[PDB]
């Protein structure tokens, strides 16, 4: 469709991160899946380059490439991990979940 915050669940046991992460077993991150077709919407916080990029893609698709649907604002989650055999607690595990998608 278009640049959109499609859902994605990361089960830590499936990627091998359950060896050190006690809780949570998984957290709902989010993936930006879609295409960035002109006009680039302002709710995706586009840049002057990504807008200039898509314009050249309209003329010749060979010289330039389309803008990409990538996360623009990442928010942290809370975890309980094991540091040196002691259960440790982290309130802000930075950069784990996606709140806003955009074209860059």
């Amino acid at each position: 469709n278009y640049c959109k915050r499609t859902p994605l669940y990361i089960d830590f046991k499936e990627i091998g991160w359950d060896s050190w992460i006690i809780a949570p077993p998984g957290y709902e991150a989010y993936e930006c899946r879609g295409v960035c077709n002109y006009p680039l919407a302002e709710h995706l916080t586009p840049t002057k380059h990504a807008i200039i990029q898509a314009l050249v893609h309209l003329k010749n698709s060979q010289k330039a490439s389309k803008a990409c649907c990538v996360p623009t604002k990442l928010e942290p989650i809370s975890i309980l991990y094991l540091d040196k055999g002691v259960v440790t607690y982290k309130f802000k595990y930075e950069g784990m979940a996606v709140s806003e998608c955009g074209c860059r």
Binding site: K13, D18, S19, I22, A23, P24, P25, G26, Y27, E28, E75, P76, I77, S78, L80, V87, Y89, F91, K92, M96, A97, S99
Partner: protein, 85 residues
Amino acid sequence: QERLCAFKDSHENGTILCSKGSTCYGLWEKDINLVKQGCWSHIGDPQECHYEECVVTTTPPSIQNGTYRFCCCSTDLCNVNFTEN
């Protein structure tokens, strides 16, 4: 709004004021001993954790042969006790 929860590691004598819509979390190892308590970020978004009680609905992780019981809830001072199923 701002949710006060139990604490076990401003905080003042076993409580902590969790702000910004954070939830109450509680960790145990089961002889049910208490490991830690405090605040849990809503951005973890397992399901936004808008539960009224601390319920360990998930099977405990396979580490330590399934002893750690973790849960979160969205009521004030709810991480004091947990449940099962």
